[PDB]
A paper describes a structure:
N-valyl-histidine derived from proteolytic digestion of the N-terminus of the HbA1c β-chain. Fructosyl amine oxidases (FAOXs) are FAD-containing enzymes that catalyze the oxidative deglycosylation of fructosyl amino acids such as fructosyl valine and/or ε-fructosyl lysine, which are the degradation products of HbA1c and GA, respectively. As members of the FAOX family, fructosyl peptide oxidases (FPOXs) are also known as candidates for diagnostic enzymes.
The bound acetate of wild-type PnFPOX corresponds to the position of bound beta-D-fructopyranose (BDF) in amadoriase I and the position of FSA in amadoriase II. In wild-type PnFPOX, Asn56 forms a hydrogen bond with Lys274; Lys274 forms water (W1)-mediated hydrogen bonds with N5 of FAD and hydrogen bonds with Asp54 and Lys57 and O2 of FAD via a water molecule (W2). The direct distance between Lys274 and Asp54 is 5.48–6.03 Å in wild-type PnFPOX. In wild-type PnFPOX, Asn56 forms a hydrogen bond with Lys274 (2.93 Å), which interacts with N5 of the isoalloxazine ring of FAD by a water-mediated hydrogen bond. The analysis of the protein channels of the structures showed that the W1, W2, and W4 positions in wild-type PnFPOX (W1′ and W4′ in PnFPOX N56A) are in the main oxygen-accessible channel. The positions of the side chains of Ser62, Arg64, Arg94 and His373 create a smaller cavity for accepting and recognizing substrates in PnFPOX compared to EtFPOX.
Author numbering: 1 to 431
Amino acid sequence: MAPSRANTSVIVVGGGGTIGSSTALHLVRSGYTPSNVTVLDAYPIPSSQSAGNDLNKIMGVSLRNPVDLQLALEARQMWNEDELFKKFFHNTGRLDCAHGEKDIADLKSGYQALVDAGLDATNEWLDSEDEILKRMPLLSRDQIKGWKAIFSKDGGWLAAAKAINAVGEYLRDQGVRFGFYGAGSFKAPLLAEGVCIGVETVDGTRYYADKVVLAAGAWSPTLVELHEQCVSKAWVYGHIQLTPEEAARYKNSPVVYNGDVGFFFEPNEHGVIKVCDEFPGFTRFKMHQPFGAKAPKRISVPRSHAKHPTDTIPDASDVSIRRAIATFMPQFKNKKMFNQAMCWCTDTADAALLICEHPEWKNFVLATGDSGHSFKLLPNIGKHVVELLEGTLADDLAHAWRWRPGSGDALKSRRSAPAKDLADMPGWNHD
Ligand SMILES: *Cc1cc2c(cc1C)nc1c(=O)[nH]c(=O)nc-1n2C[C@H](O)[C@H](O)[C@H](O)COP(=O)(O)OP(=O)(O)OC[C@H]1O[C@@H](n2cnc3c(N)ncnc32)[C@H](O)[C@@H]1O
């Protein structure tokens, strides 16, 4: 008979990242014995190459699939109420802006979706630049002519790296096992009679456990064969440095986002503003054999800034981010960004997660397909990964997250175009 929860060992591969750390946290909260939980990652939590290892991420409700509502409301509750997470949510609001006929129309129906989901109380439609300027006076009336926006009072930003670090300190304090670098870089599951019984890492270390969760983010489809269910893509950011006096003016600013321009956050405690552009992401295709492939594979394999710290971003991305600064912060349009880097996610065709047992390898569970929208789910997502492990996952979540090679084209996903490839986007490589 299977061991009880208290005696069930679980390896979380990618446990130094977002979904992995959340899964480990929820194993412990659910009453798995901490010393039976092993967190393996290529890098110490929060992993240097985790998409969650950043200054900030946006918190808000965005409804791309039906399950998104439950998941966002769960996350919102915990960012507000959970003592582990609360201090890292800054509830400054989110300004979701659009300009142009198409983008405005899409935003208007998006607003109605929020209303229809029951969130009328915390979302307001701003129908002119004058209304936007009321919610953030530091935007330039010259740059935002003809813009409209949704203002979400319940949104804001998340101190992402700090939050994962706090989870790591919880796990450490509880007695969770850690393996990093050579001792944490997964290469293969260990299989016996079609059951997964552990993993082996690049340095030959073998870990044995009753269950294994693969929460390896953008690396997931590089590590095991996923039949193009997830296609990994990079997005980009840069940092600019403000004087203390400049930074003080921006204190408690709402997050500002425009799907056609990018987004930016208030300065952190060091006076640094992080800026992203917005675009369909970049692949980096190369020949690579994930465990379980039965033919030659060309797949998008992350070019990791952690492994290649002299990398920056494509020239085109430097241009686009600078255009975002010129639009959002014209007074800063001549600052030189630094710490430019690529940040990796993996898209499913429908932008819902991939959280399911492997169809052949019993007790090996996928927990990936983050689709560029999942940091905000740090507090809660692990709860549902545990439910999946235990066979108690609700039908709607399980269906949305199921193994689905048939589902569609992840290279385009729900985005405006198929991602371009870093091979065709010069300027990031300084080898
Ligand atoms: C890139 C990005 C993403 C992003 C964003 C802006 C950028 C530039 N803005 C967001 C926002 O405003 N709000 C939001 O909610 N999300 C936003 N995103 C997306 C978000 O960052 C991601 O969706 C999410 O963080 C991904 O979580 P996931 O757990 O899937 O991925 P990860 O945190 O990168 O963790 C993966 C871990 O796996 C480890 N790894 C890799 N290979 C191995 C091996 N071989 N063995 C063991 N571990 C491995 C990595 O080290 C990593 O820690």
